[PDB]
Ligand binder design. Structure first.
Ligand code: NA
Ligand code: NA
Lengths: 78, 78
């Protein structure tokens, strides 16, 4: 897993926890099942753009805020 | 179910999410299985004191902090 794949997983999980959400709440709100959410948060290699859009909606985060949090994580830690 | 039983379950879940843990992470660290953790989060009626001590250990919360969070929930919301 490259730094980018680990940090896409990292930012999904970080926002989910910031929001007080379980994996099962995010599964329900993203229309992707709980094993799929757990899998993505471990390795985001095969997460598709369509599924990332569903997860941003289920986190109630805009795409701009999600990608800004990702860029900050890359800049300050890669 | 009474406010007490609901609030034991609420406080367990609240600390679990504050610790960034899934139900499987907590099951593993408490030595109680995932279905047992999920059942007591729904309804703590049959949670024993010994299982509660295993859970507080798996959350790495002291019994004093656990019970102080429960009293603050009861006072503020009941
Ligand atoms: Na996908
Ligand atoms: Na559950």
């Amino acid at each position: 897993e490259s730094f980018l794949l680990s940090k896409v997983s990292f930012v999904i999980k970080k926002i989910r926890l910031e929001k007080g959400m379980t994996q099962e709440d995010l599964a329900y709100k993203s229309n992707l099942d709980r094993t799929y959410i757990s899998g993505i948060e471990r390795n985001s290699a095969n997460l598709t753009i369509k599924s990332l859009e569903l997860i941003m909606k289920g986190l109630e985060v805009s795409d701009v805020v999600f990608f800004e949090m990702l860029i900050k994580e890359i800049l300050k830690h890669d």
